[PDB]
């Protein structure tokens, strides 16, 4: 129900280290990476371009394992 996920706050370019400005929290479906993981994700890289408003999924972040 009100599980919030990490959502792209701007287009995130491929192979670019995540910064706090790039990540917002929103209740979306399907559910993606939990919004409490935003601190964890800083400096991790995405393996593909992530368009604005896209929910970040585990498979999109290199090295992510919950």
From Swiss-Prot:
InterPro entries, per the entry: AFP_Neu5c_C, AFP_Neu5c_C_sf, Antifreeze_III
Tissue expression from the record: Detected in blood serum (at protein level).
* UniProt keyword terms in alphabetical order: Antifreeze protein, Secreted
Localisation per UniProt entry: Secreted
> Is Secreted one of the keywords UniProt gives this record?
yes
One Gene Ontology term, aspect cellular component: extracellular region
Chief location = secreted
Q: Where is the AFP-like domain?
A: 5-64
Task: Sum up the protein's function in the record's words.
Answer: Contributes to protect fish blood from freezing at subzero sea water temperatures. Lowers the blood freezing point. Binds to nascent ice crystals and prevents further growth.
Q: Which family does it belong to?
A: Belongs to the type-III AFP family.
Q: What is this protein called?
A: Type-3 ice-structuring protein HPLC 12
């Amino acid at each position: 129900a009100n599980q919030a996920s990490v959502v792209a706050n701007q287009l995130i370019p491929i192979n670019t280290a995540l910064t706090l400005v790039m990540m917002r929290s929103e209740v979306v479906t399907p559910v993606g990476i939990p919004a409490e993981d935003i601190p964890r994700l800083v400096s991790m890289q995405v393996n593909r371009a992530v368009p604005l408003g896209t929910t970040l999924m585990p498979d999109m972040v290199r090295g992510y394992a919950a």
